[PDB]
Design an enzyme around this catalytic site. Structure first.
Site, PDB file in Angstrom:
ATOM      1  N   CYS A   1      18.287   2.485  19.227  1.00  0.00           N
ATOM      2  CA  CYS A   1      17.895   2.985  17.930  1.00  0.00           C
ATOM      3  C   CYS A   1      16.502   2.489  17.613  1.00  0.00           C
ATOM      4  O   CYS A   1      16.300   1.307  17.561  1.00  0.00           O
ATOM      5  CB  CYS A   1      18.827   2.386  16.881  1.00  0.00           C
ATOM      6  SG  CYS A   1      18.440   2.979  15.183  1.00  0.00           S
TER       7      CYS A   1
ATOM      8  N   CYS B   1      16.888   0.187  13.942  1.00  0.00           N
ATOM      9  CA  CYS B   1      17.603  -1.087  13.941  1.00  0.00           C
ATOM     10  C   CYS B   1      17.610  -1.833  15.276  1.00  0.00           C
ATOM     11  O   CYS B   1      18.116  -2.979  15.321  1.00  0.00           O
ATOM     12  CB  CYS B   1      19.027  -0.972  13.342  1.00  0.00           C
ATOM     13  SG  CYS B   1      20.215  -0.243  14.546  1.00  0.00           S
TER      14      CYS B   1
ATOM     15  N   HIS C   1      25.245   7.242  16.707  1.00  0.00           N
ATOM     16  CA  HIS C   1      24.543   6.214  15.951  1.00  0.00           C
ATOM     17  C   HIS C   1      23.375   6.856  15.191  1.00  0.00           C
ATOM     18  O   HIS C   1      23.134   6.464  14.049  1.00  0.00           O
ATOM     19  CB  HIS C   1      24.041   5.116  16.883  1.00  0.00           C
ATOM     20  CG  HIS C   1      23.323   4.005  16.119  1.00  0.00           C
ATOM     21  ND1 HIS C   1      23.968   2.986  15.517  1.00  0.00           N
ATOM     22  CD2 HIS C   1      21.964   3.909  15.764  1.00  0.00           C
ATOM     23  CE1 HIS C   1      23.030   2.181  14.913  1.00  0.00           C
ATOM     24  NE2 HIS C   1      21.819   2.772  15.080  1.00  0.00           N
TER      25      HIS C   1
ATOM     26  N   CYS D   1       4.755 -14.698  21.456  1.00  0.00           N
ATOM     27  CA  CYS D   1       4.638 -13.528  22.335  1.00  0.00           C
ATOM     28  C   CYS D   1       4.035 -12.390  21.545  1.00  0.00           C
ATOM     29  O   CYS D   1       4.299 -12.253  20.359  1.00  0.00           O
ATOM     30  CB  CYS D   1       6.010 -13.033  22.931  1.00  0.00           C
ATOM     31  SG  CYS D   1       6.747 -14.475  23.844  1.00  0.00           S
ATOM     32  N   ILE D   2       3.290 -11.525  22.257  1.00  0.00           N
ATOM     33  CA  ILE D   2       2.771 -10.327  21.648  1.00  0.00           C
ATOM     34  C   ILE D   2       3.075  -9.178  22.595  1.00  0.00           C
ATOM     35  O   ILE D   2       2.868  -9.310  23.833  1.00  0.00           O
ATOM     36  CB  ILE D   2       1.269 -10.461  21.285  1.00  0.00           C
ATOM     37  CG1 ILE D   2       0.683  -9.133  20.816  1.00  0.00           C
ATOM     38  CG2 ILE D   2       0.417 -10.911  22.519  1.00  0.00           C
ATOM     39  CD1 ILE D   2      -0.615  -9.365  20.025  1.00  0.00           C
TER      40      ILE D   2
ATOM     41  N   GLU E   1       0.077 -18.643  22.495  1.00  0.00           N
ATOM     42  CA  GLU E   1       0.712 -19.441  23.527  1.00  0.00           C
ATOM     43  C   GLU E   1       0.461 -18.866  24.930  1.00  0.00           C
ATOM     44  O   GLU E   1       0.464 -17.619  25.134  1.00  0.00           O
ATOM     45  CB  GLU E   1       2.190 -19.410  23.173  1.00  0.00           C
ATOM     46  CG  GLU E   1       3.019 -20.312  23.984  1.00  0.00           C
ATOM     47  CD  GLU E   1       4.468 -20.369  23.469  1.00  0.00           C
ATOM     48  OE1 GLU E   1       4.866 -19.898  22.340  1.00  0.00           O
ATOM     49  OE2 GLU E   1       5.253 -20.952  24.208  1.00  0.00           O
TER      50      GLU E   1
ATOM     51  N   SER F   1      -0.460 -12.132  29.444  1.00  0.00           N
ATOM     52  CA  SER F   1      -0.440 -11.057  30.433  1.00  0.00           C
ATOM     53  C   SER F   1      -1.852 -10.697  30.855  1.00  0.00           C
ATOM     54  O   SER F   1      -2.789 -11.133  30.204  1.00  0.00           O
ATOM     55  CB  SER F   1       0.255  -9.844  29.833  1.00  0.00           C
ATOM     56  OG  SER F   1      -0.593  -9.159  28.920  1.00  0.00           O
TER      57      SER F   1
ATOM     58  N   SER G   1     -11.830  -9.852  24.597  1.00  0.00           N
ATOM     59  CA  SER G   1     -12.661  -8.838  23.954  1.00  0.00           C
ATOM     60  C   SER G   1     -12.641  -8.980  22.427  1.00  0.00           C
ATOM     61  O   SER G   1     -13.651  -8.747  21.741  1.00  0.00           O
ATOM     62  CB  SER G   1     -12.212  -7.461  24.394  1.00  0.00           C
ATOM     63  OG  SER G   1     -12.526  -7.249  25.757  1.00  0.00           O
TER      64      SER G   1
HETATM   65  O1  LIG Z   1      -2.592  -2.584  23.922  1.00  0.00           O
HETATM   66  C1  LIG Z   1      -3.107  -3.717  24.121  1.00  0.00           C
HETATM   67  N1  LIG Z   1      -4.498  -3.872  24.283  1.00  0.00           N
HETATM   68  N2  LIG Z   1      -5.371  -2.752  24.281  1.00  0.00           N
HETATM   69  S1  LIG Z   1      -6.098  -2.352  22.686  1.00  0.00           S
HETATM   70  O2  LIG Z   1      -6.595  -0.964  22.745  1.00  0.00           O
HETATM   71  O3  LIG Z   1      -5.275  -2.658  21.516  1.00  0.00           O
HETATM   72  C2  LIG Z   1      -7.558  -3.418  22.396  1.00  0.00           C
HETATM   73  C3  LIG Z   1      -7.326  -4.787  22.385  1.00  0.00           C
HETATM   74  C4  LIG Z   1      -8.343  -5.671  22.121  1.00  0.00           C
HETATM   75  C5  LIG Z   1      -9.636  -5.126  21.911  1.00  0.00           C
HETATM   76  C6  LIG Z   1     -10.693  -6.020  21.631  1.00  0.00           C
HETATM   77  C7  LIG Z   1     -11.976  -5.439  21.435  1.00  0.00           C
HETATM   78  C8  LIG Z   1     -12.213  -4.075  21.478  1.00  0.00           C
HETATM   79  C9  LIG Z   1     -11.149  -3.190  21.680  1.00  0.00           C
HETATM   80  C10 LIG Z   1      -9.886  -3.734  21.957  1.00  0.00           C
HETATM   81  C11 LIG Z   1      -8.823  -2.823  22.179  1.00  0.00           C
HETATM   82  C12 LIG Z   1      -2.395  -4.959  24.223  1.00  0.00           C
HETATM   83  C13 LIG Z   1      -1.170  -4.985  24.928  1.00  0.00           C
HETATM   84  C14 LIG Z   1      -0.512  -6.233  25.002  1.00  0.00           C
HETATM   85  C15 LIG Z   1      -0.998  -7.464  24.415  1.00  0.00           C
HETATM   86  C16 LIG Z   1      -2.196  -7.457  23.703  1.00  0.00           C
HETATM   87  C17 LIG Z   1      -2.848  -6.225  23.629  1.00  0.00           C
HETATM   88  F1  LIG Z   1      -4.014  -6.272  22.888  1.00  0.00           F
HETATM   89 ZN   LIG Z   2      20.236   2.049  14.077  1.00  0.00          ZN
END
Ligand SMILES: O=C(NNS(=O)(=O)c1ccc2ccccc2c1)c1ccccc1F
Ligand SMILES: [Zn+2]
Length: 272
Positions: free
Chosen positions: A34, A37, A50, A140-141, A174, A178, A187
């Site tokens: 889902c 949720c 569901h 974590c992100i 932390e 990745s 960046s």
């Molecule tokens: O999707 C992601 N990264 N790609 S993004 O397009 O969001 C991105 C991320 C950082 C940037 C910094 C400066 C200029 C442009 C940037 C574009 C991403 C995936 C997992 C963990 C962190 C992340 F940031």
């Molecule tokens: Zn649900």
């Protein structure tokens, strides 16, 4: 045998890593979630049933950010345990190094959604220890694969520093990060620092930059090194850059996509 594909919303997504859903869930061809949720189901039929019954159309917890159709919900792991455990198992399909799925009470989760007439659609999240002995401002992100490289990861990284700034504290994610996490943070730090070096004019020191941005001195220094913008003198790193070179960097392809920005006027938050 492991979960290898999920259906969530209108997306089918292949797994990247093992996630410890119960064994019986792994035996199926797909796991069906889902999207509101995060309940996980074994069958297209239990999923369709569901979908007609579940009343949730956004994450639980508090909407601490809303601007147009981008929203963030703050979800305390204590208050919404099952939703948070469901989220950490979803996340572990895409994160190699996350080790925590069930013991969610020490964490708060920040869920990013994109909203339309049907409801608030999950894009990604970051978790944060309520008390971090190491000053981590993200645990974590994770951005779901169909949303990666589309500006949402930059948004969440910025949002995590906007929280740190309101807490008057520095913080760093932390480790380990990745591959895409590393490039994304580097960046982000480079943009933020280069914009401050253009703006305040005007000799800011490293400790100044750390207080203005909540980026730790170490992460400021590693970034400035990658940009060749620091000299070293008698054991001290010192900023060394011309206004022209700042502008050369800011004009690069790296910084050219229109960002989804965190508007601090739309952030409703104070220290927990
Ligand atoms: O999707 C992601 N990264 N790609 S993004 O397009 O969001 C991105 C991320 C950082 C940037 C910094 C400066 C200029 C442009 C940037 C574009 C991403 C995936 C997992 C963990 C962190 C992340 F940031
Ligand atoms: Zn649900």
């Amino acid at each position: 045998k492991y979960v290898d594909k999920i259906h969530i919303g209108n997306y089918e997504i292949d797994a990247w890593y093992f996630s410890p859903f119960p064994e019986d869930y792994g035996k199926q061809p797909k796991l069906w979630l889902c999207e509101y949720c995060l309940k996980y189901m074994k069958y297209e039929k239990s999923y369709r049933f569901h979908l007609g019954q579940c009343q949730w159309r956004q994450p639980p917890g508090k909407e601490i950010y809303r601007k147009s159709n981008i929203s963030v919900h703050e979800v305390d792991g204590k208050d919404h345990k099952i939703y948070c455990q469901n989220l950490c198992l979803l996340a572990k399909l895409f994160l190699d190094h996350k080790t925590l799925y069930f013991d969610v009470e020490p964490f708060v989760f920040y869920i990013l959604t994109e909203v339309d007439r049907q409801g608030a659609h999950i894009v990604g999240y970051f978790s944060k220890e309520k008390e971090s002995p190491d000053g981590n401002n993200v645990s974590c992100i994770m951005i779901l694969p169909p949303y990666q490289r589309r500006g949402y990861g930059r948004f969440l990284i910025a949002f995590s520093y906007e929280l740190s700034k309101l807490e008057s504290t520095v913080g760093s994610p932390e480790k380990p990060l990745s591959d895409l996490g590393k490039l994304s943070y580097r960046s982000y730090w480079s943009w933020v620092l280069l914009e401050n070096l253009r703006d305040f004019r005007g000799t800011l020191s490293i400790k100044d930059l750390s207080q203005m941005t909540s980026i730790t001195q170490n992460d400021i220094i590693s970034t400035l090194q990658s940009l060749n913008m620091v000299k070293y003198w008698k054991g001290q790193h010192v900023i060394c850059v011309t206004p022209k070179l700042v502008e050369e960097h800011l004009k690069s392809a790296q910084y050219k996509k229109p960002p989804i920005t965190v508007d601090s006027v739309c952030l409703k938050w104070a220290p927990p």
